[PDB]
Design a protein around this ligand. Sequence first.
Ligand SMILES: CN/C(C)=C1\C(=O)Nc2ccc(S(=O)(=O)N(CC(C)C)C[C@@H](O)[C@H](Cc3ccccc3)NC(=O)O[C@H]3CO[C@H]4OCC[C@H]43)cc21
Lengths: 99, 99
Amino acid sequence: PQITLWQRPLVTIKIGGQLKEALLDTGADDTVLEEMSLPGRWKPKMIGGIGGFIKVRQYDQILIEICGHKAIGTVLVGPTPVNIIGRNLLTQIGCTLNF
Amino acid sequence: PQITLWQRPLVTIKIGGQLKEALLDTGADDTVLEEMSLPGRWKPKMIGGIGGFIKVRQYDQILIEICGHKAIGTVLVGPTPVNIIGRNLLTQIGCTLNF
Ligand SMILES: CN/C(C)=C1\C(=O)Nc2ccc(S(=O)(=O)N(CC(C)C)C[C@@H](O)[C@H](Cc3ccccc3)NC(=O)O[C@H]3CO[C@H]4OCC[C@H]43)cc21
């Protein structure tokens, strides 16, 4: 679908058998999710934002279904204030900017 | 134009008679620019991000030309690590997400 930007672009995602809402965020290289229950191994990472840096858990090859479109990729987990779908997954569901 | 998301969506903007590069960022409600030389009055504000909060200067009704499309709106100025065009201006140049 086409999405205009008068409101936050939020979509429902299914990850880890859970349902969540997340922002399609072109300003985010990588997908970062709020603290959540996710199976398996992870690596320690930090990412930076407006405001400074957070420590996250990096999970690779994680399946995420984003408004019904499946994608597999890296998902970062930690104290973000909002669940964010970043460009690593946006390119996989064919998402583009248009003006 | 259509913009795919394999790379950061950067565009050249003209603001304040200066040329800058900025990220089209659907995850940003408001446009925030790195420290820059801008004429006139401003109000003190804080905005929050991944990582915590920054203090910015809020300038209203600022003209910005974004990949050749003019927009007037609020522009926040302060210690962001990247110049960001947020949805307050993205809606004005007709920018949409598509998947
Ligand atoms: C090395 N890689 C980097 C830097 C990132 C990554 O890999 N995944 C990321 C996911 C998110 C972020 S970010 O949140 O820090 N971010 C970078 C932006 C500053 C260039 C994305 C940006 O869209 C954030 C998303 C956000 C929304 C709500 C709360 C916190 C973060 N936008 C943002 O900071 O917006 C400011 C500007 O206007 C307001 O809208 C809501 C927050 C306010 C960075 C990264």
